[PDB]
Amino acid sequence: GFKQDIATIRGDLRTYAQDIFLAFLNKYPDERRYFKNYVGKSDQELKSMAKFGDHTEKVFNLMMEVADRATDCVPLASDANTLVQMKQHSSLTTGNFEKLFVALVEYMRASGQSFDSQSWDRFGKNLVSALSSAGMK
Amino acid sequence: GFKQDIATIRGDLRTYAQDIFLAFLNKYPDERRYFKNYVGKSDQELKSMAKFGDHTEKVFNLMMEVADRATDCVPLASDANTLVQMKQHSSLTTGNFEKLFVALVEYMRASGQSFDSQSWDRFGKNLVSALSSAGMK
Numbered sequence A, B: 001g002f003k004q005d006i007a008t009i010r011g012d013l014r015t016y017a018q019d020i021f022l023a024f025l026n027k028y029p030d031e032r033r034y035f036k037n038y039v040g041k042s043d044q045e046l047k048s049m050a051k052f053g054d055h056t057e058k059v060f061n062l063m064m065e066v067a068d069r070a071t072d073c074v075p076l077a078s079d080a081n082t083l084v085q086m087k088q089h090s091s092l093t094t095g096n097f098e099k100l101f102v103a104l105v106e107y108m109r110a111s112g113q114s115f116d117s118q119s120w121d122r123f124g125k126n127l128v129s130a131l132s133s134a135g136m137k
């Protein structure tokens, strides 16, 4: 289930984080706009850029904490507030998050690993709703 | 073969019962709602709950009894009836059992141990047929 999935991802975090984020950027190429020095680079080029690995790990470290802190895939309001208020997220709207989670769920369904993809879909919806309540456009 | 597999499973019943049951829940996450005390728990979390170990072993002990009593992987009519009329199984349909056996067979095929997975598939199908003939929806 969802709780087990958090442990699965945490068990090989850097790999899942990079693979899911690349799935995101490749599925929504327009989204790469938000990521300066990621433009014009293949997957392998990105995976050799120390900054890409470091930042994507930090993203998924936090995402797993938000997931772990959730009840029935509904995140804490405080976690949503943090995601809205972070300076790094000043240019984002909830559509950006919707996209990330569509890609994540797709990645999970396509994988050999047994994820509860439906729970992740709900988590992404509930996170988006929480972002909206916290004031993201 | 099938009779040897019953011995393999019985020799380490705790471990196989937990393994296979978790494989079932993780493959079919919607099945977890039948086990309310297991909601929101990872695999390793479940393994430190007394009732999880006790329940799962009692399930697999009965399953192995039914398997041992079968002839050519066809269970007794009285055993199928027992499983249909159990108070704990009132809400169940044969689909729930079909799913358990799909998970069990998948687990056997993925394992490093030499199971007669086709016999288990036949047993599951014959058990489903026998549940149906015993009136399960």
Ligand code: HEM
Residues within 6 Å of the ligand: A031, A034, A035, A054, A055, A056, A058, A059, A060, A062, A063, A066, A088, A089, A092, A096, A097, A100
């Ligand atoms: C639940 C989902 C998300 C979480 C938990 C999260 C978390 C984080 C964290 C921890 C950082 C800091 C990374 C660091 O400094 O090393 C970060 C930065 C950033 N995030 Fe998010 N993020 C999420 C979703 C998104 C989405 C959907 C987008 C845009 C499509 C986005 C865009 C950015 C940008 C532009 C930065 C700064 C640039 C960079 O780190 O290279 N984030 N995020």
Ligand code: HEM
Residues within 6 Å of the ligand: B031, B034, B035, B054, B055, B058, B059, B060, B062, B063, B083, B088, B089, B092, B096, B097, B100
């Ligand atoms: C051949 C397969 C099965 C056997 C031998 C079996 C056997 C058992 C046994 C012996 C118990 C009582 C455990 C105890 O004494 O505490 C039990 C309980 C229960 N069973 Fe089954 N079962 C089977 C399949 C299923 C399936 C497929 C489901 C649902 C998907 C299910 C749902 C339940 C539930 C909800 C309980 C009560 C909850 C619990 O004991 O924790 N069973 N089963």
Ligand SMILES: Oc1ccc(F)cc1
Residues within 6 Å of the ligand: A021, A052, A055, A056, A059
């Ligand atoms: O540096 C990053 C990497 C991934 C992400 F989602 C946000 C910032």
